[PDB]
């Protein structure tokens, strides 16, 4: 049983794969999996500013998680944590903080 | 190699369980330490926006 929704800005390919394979597939408003290929001004904002996101009851994953699984053997491997999709207002600083060298660590 | 989110392969893990998974995990990789701290900042500011606004008053 794996319910999952997709913001408007998601490739139909990814939605098709979700339909085709997984647990029992369903795609309601609330769901169990929150997928998106965007975090700027799509439907996804309605997650980020929900109380569930504030109270750690909602994590948005990048819908390319499904692409990674489709190009894996079946469903094995492909940990979710790699596809955490944070709010776009954070991403600029997340990249830099990760990319920076040890002699920099600017903050 | 143990590190939640990088070994997040087990079934039943989803968007409701995940945030609590990492927080509960004794050992976290740098990438997820960064993302978590970044997300906590965002969530803090939503809360502090609700409690501050510019008009909301604190009165019994
Ligand atoms: Zn990790």
Author numbering:
A (entry chain A): 4 to 110
B (entry chain B): 590 to 649
Reproduce text from the manuscript describing this model.
We found that a short fragment of TERB1 consisting of residues 587–636, which is adjacent to the TRF1-binding motif (TERB1TBM, residues 642–656) of TERB1, was necessary and sufficient for binding with the N-terminal domain of TERB2 (residues 1–116). TERB2NTD consists of a three-stranded β sheet (β1–β2–β3) at one end and six α helices that flank the β sheet and scatter at the periphery of the structure. TERB1T2BM is a helix–turn–helix (HtH) motif with a long tail that folds back to the middle turn between the two helices. Notably, Cys592 and Cys595 at the N-terminus of the tail together with Cys618 and His621 in the middle of the HtH motif chelate a Zn2+ ion, playing a key role in defining the overall shape of TERB1T2BM. TERB1T2BM adopts an extended conformation and packs against the concaved surface of TERB2NTD, burying ~1400 Å2 of surface area at the interface. The long helix H2 of TERB1T2BM fits into a large hydrophobic groove formed by helices α3 and α6 and loops L33 and L56 of TERB2NTD through extensive contacts involving a panel of hydrophobic residues at both sides of the interface. Helix H1 and the N-terminal tail of TERB1T2BM pack against a flat hydrophobic surface of TERB2NTD formed by the β sheet and helices α3 and α5.
In the present study, we characterize the TERB1–TERB2 and TERB2–MAJIN interactions and determine the crystal structures of the N-terminal domains of TERB2 and MAJIN in complex with TERB2-binding motif of TERB1 and MAJIN-binding motif of TERB2, respectively. To reveal the structural basis for the interactions between TERB1 and TERB2 and between TERB2 and MAJIN, we crystallized the TERB1587–659–TERB22–116 and the TERB2119–220–MAJIN2–149 complexes and determined their structures using single-wavelength anomalous dispersion (SAD) method at resolutions of 3.3 and 2.9 Å, respectively.
